[PDB]
């Protein structure tokens, strides 16, 4: 007999608010970035570098508010954020993603990004095709915001990230969120949408590992020429590698 405990309800309220304080659905800060350029060679890079750097900041802001995250060592906090950042960015971006034209729509035409924009940041379909497939499959899940924020937090607190020291602690924190998500689906998510919803959500986390691996490869290739590295931000270089 599954029931959402007070603690579990408390976890959901906190993650919801954490997300609200770190995702601006008005996209007002986008004016601060270097301008988008579309018409050849990496013209979207300065803009998307800035957007991604901004996004890393918001993801760290979110992770800090995850119940139990603060109990980790500073080393482990660092390991979990460096390895998950790109994945949580891909997940949180689903909120602006649209199946109409398969783009990320951040308010205006200028801040509406399609596959060619992303390729003009230095990416190929080796990444972008699985990325679009991911965004589509996620949108079709029609997650409750409660589920979305839980998935992001579960993604962050993963015990098998390379370099984790206190794996047992990382697992104990994630387990509490996993249990919270599973109970939420049972109690608040009605059928048919609820069918296999947990397994499908975890499947999206596997898809994210593959996307992260391919992003990293294309990033190491991009960031190879110092002229391209120059166009990134200090936070991007520090978090994604130098």
């Amino acid at each position: 007999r599954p029931k959402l405990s007070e603690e579990q309800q408390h976890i959901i309220a906190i993650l919801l608010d954490a997300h609200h304080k770190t995702y601006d659905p008005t996209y007002a800060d986008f004016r601060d970035f270097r301008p988008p350029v579309r018409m050849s060679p990496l013209s979207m890079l300065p803009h998307l570098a800035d957007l991604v750097s901004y996004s890393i900041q918001k993801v760290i802001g979110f992770a800090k508010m995850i119940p139990g995250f603060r109990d980790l060592t500073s080393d482990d906090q660092i390991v979990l954020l460096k390895s998950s950042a790109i994945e949580v960015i891909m997940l949180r971006s689903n909120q602006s993603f649209t199946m109409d034209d398969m783009s990320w729509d951040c308010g205006s035409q200028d801040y509406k990004y399609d596959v060619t924009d992303v390729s003009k940041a230095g990416h190929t379909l080796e990444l972008i095709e699985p990325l679009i497939k991911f965004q589509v499959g996620l949108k079709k899940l029609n997650l409750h915001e409660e589920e979305h924020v839980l998935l992001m937090a579960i993604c962050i607190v993963s015990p098998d990230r390379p370099g984790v020291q206190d794996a047992k602690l990382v697992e104990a924190i994630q387990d509490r969120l996993s249990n919270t998500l599973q109970t939420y689906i049972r109690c608040r998510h009605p059928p048919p949408g609820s069918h296999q919803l947990y397994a499908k959500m975890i499947q999206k986390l596997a898809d994210l590992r593959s996307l992260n691996e391919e992003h990293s490869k294309q990033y190491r290739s991009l960031s190879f020429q110092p002229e391209n590295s120059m166009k990134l931000t200090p936070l991007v270089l520090e978090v994604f590698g130098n």
């Binding site: 802001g61 660092i78 520090e238």
Partner: peptide, 12 residues
Amino acid sequence: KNHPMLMNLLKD
């Protein structure tokens, strides 16, 4: 490893 900016963004 040396992550001064991430470290600072994480501090309480």
